[PDB]
């Protein structure tokens, strides 16, 4: 052989985990940002970034533990261990924002390294990939929320913080400051995911409802051969079932599976191009109508103007406590209080 | 308007039975595009290039 | 300088049931986006 | 009642001109079978 072919005969062996010649970008960058995230939940913390106790070491029991963000007064600078932000000395690197940018970029590059990976095994078995096409759902969520949402706005404090409740803050951020519900690009994504959740539930039912008596025992998935050319579900009784109950039915067994690929992948892509409007905060929280006679007319009483005062309940209540960067302090009769509550 | 009231009145998000639900839903989001991708991937050849590859077999 | 006949141009085959999917998809985008155009 | 003055132009071309694109292609396809 040569010099390079001996290497390409190494990484394409049948090792039990397949290492992959595209895996040398994955396996460093995917053990970091999993294990980079797993120190940020335990040991390194906030409270020098935006005044919060968000670690296991300060003692929050995982449903409010997160590696957070850098500070708001810090810009969009990538917090290198080696940069101006910190010049190594990672003690001071760590608690000055920083950590997450270690797992934001490595989490970005491993997602390149995983989508390079399922392209790479797809040629080795020769299989015509659509998993990499269906990973364009997941990669367009990550690079347009955790990457391209903060770069439209101010620096990476307004990026979501990596935890279960750090995401939950970023949820109620996007309710109040942007109205991320009721803009239409998000609402196709709820049609994508909940439409995707039916089409794996309803397709998971009927293959377990039309089965073909090759076993003589009582459980069904005994004696199903993997090297079996005859098809294990009916599709003639299943089409006869759904032409009667729902009235419409999948009259061929392909495009039943292409629709299950299509329905959550184009859900996330429509959801991905909404937050890039939110990145430059083209929010569409306001209707051009339905507001002038919310101003002139107290007799005009609707759910949308009921909903738009709820978002004022966000933006003047949590914003002194969410962002202590500006030191927002409020004298307790400037806050919108509805009544006795 | 209902959901923000339920987040207000008694706090939906920090509750594990809701958190088990989205784990079913986001799991059901992926497993639709996981199972539906790979049989669409591992389809056999019965057509040529110019037509739809969703044609070379008859229903049933 | 002189014309000929194409050895090309396969026609299109949009199905009856695939018309229903495309007609419905435009009409849900109609009932979604028409509020935002107002 | 206030209105944007141009959405009824916008959401009548948003619904028609892809659907009559789609309505062209069905009657394209269905007339091929029919034994000329």
């Amino acid at each position: 052989r040569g010099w390079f072919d001996v290497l390409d005969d190494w990484l394409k062996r049948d090792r039990f985990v397949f290492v992959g010649w595209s895996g040398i970008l994955l396996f460093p960058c995917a053990y970091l940002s999993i294990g980079g995230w797993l120190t940020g939940t335990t040991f390194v913390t906030s409270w020098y970034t935006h005044g919060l106790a968000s670690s296991y070491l300060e003692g929050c029991n995982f449903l409010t533990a997160a590696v957070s963000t850098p500070a708001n007064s810090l810009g969009h600078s990538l917090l290198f261990l080696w940069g101006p932000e910190a010049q190594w000395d990672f003690t001071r690197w760590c608690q000055l924002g920083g950590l997450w940018a270690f797992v934001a970029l490595h989490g970005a590059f491993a997602l390149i390294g995983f989508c390079l990976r399922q392209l790479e095994i797809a040629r080795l078995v020769g299989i015509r990939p659509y998993n990499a096409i269906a990973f364009t759902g997941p990669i367009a969520v990550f690079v347009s929320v955790f990457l391209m949402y903060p770069l439209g706005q101010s620096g990476w404090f307004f990026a979501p913080s990596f935890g279960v409740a750090g995401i939950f803050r970023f949820i109620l951020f996007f309710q109040g400051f942007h109205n991320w519900t009721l803009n239409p690009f998000h609402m196709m994504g709820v049609a994508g995911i909940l439409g995707g959740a039916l089409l794996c539930a309803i397709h998971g039912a009927t293959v377990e409802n039309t089965l073909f008596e090759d076993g003589e025992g009582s459980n069904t998935f005994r004696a199903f051969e993997p090297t079996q050319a005859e098809e294990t579900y009916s599709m003639v009784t299943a089409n006869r079932f759904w032409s009667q109950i729902f009235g419409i039915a999948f009259s061929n067994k392909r495009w039943l599976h292409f629709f299950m690929l299509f329905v959550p992948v184009t859900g996330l892509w429509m959801c991905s191009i909404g937050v890039v409007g939110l990145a430059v905060n083209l929010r569409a929280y306001d209707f051009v109508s339905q507001e002038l006679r919310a101003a002139e007319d107290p007799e005009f009483e609707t759910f949308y103007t009921k909903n738009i005062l709820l978002n004022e309940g966000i933006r003047a209540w949590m914003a002194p406590a969410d962002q202590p960067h500006q030191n927002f302090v409020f004298p307790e009769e400037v806050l919108p209080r509805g009544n006795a509550l | 308007n209902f959901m923000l009231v339920l987040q207000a009145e008694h706090n939906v998000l920090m509750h594990p039975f809701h958190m088990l639900g989205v784990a079913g839903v986001f799991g059901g989001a992926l497993f639709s595009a996981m199972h539906g991708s790979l049989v669409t991937s591992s389809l056999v050849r019965e057509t040529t290039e110019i037509e739809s590859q969703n044609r070379g077999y008859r229903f049933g | 300088m002189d014309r000929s006949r194409n050895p090309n141009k396969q026609p299109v085959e949009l199905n009856r049931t695939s018309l229903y999917l495309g007609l419905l998809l435009i009409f849900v985008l109609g009932i979604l986006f028409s509020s935002y155009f107002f | 009642m206030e209105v944007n003055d141009l959405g009824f132009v916008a959401s009548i071309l948003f619904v028609l001109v892809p659907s009559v694109f789609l309505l062209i292609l069905y009657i394209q396809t269905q007339s091929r079978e029919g034994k000329e």
Binding site: V236, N239, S243, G247, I248, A249, S251, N252 | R58, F59, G60 | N15, R16, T17, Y20, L23, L24, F27, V28, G30, I31, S34, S35, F38 | M1, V3, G7, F8, S11, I12, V15
Partner: peptide
Amino acid sequence: ESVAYILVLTLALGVLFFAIAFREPPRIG
């Protein structure tokens, strides 16, 4: 200004009726 939904909503309901009556009947072969 108001009858632009009820135009396009009934077209969305009208195509629900035409998919139940005028579907392609799936023939086994």
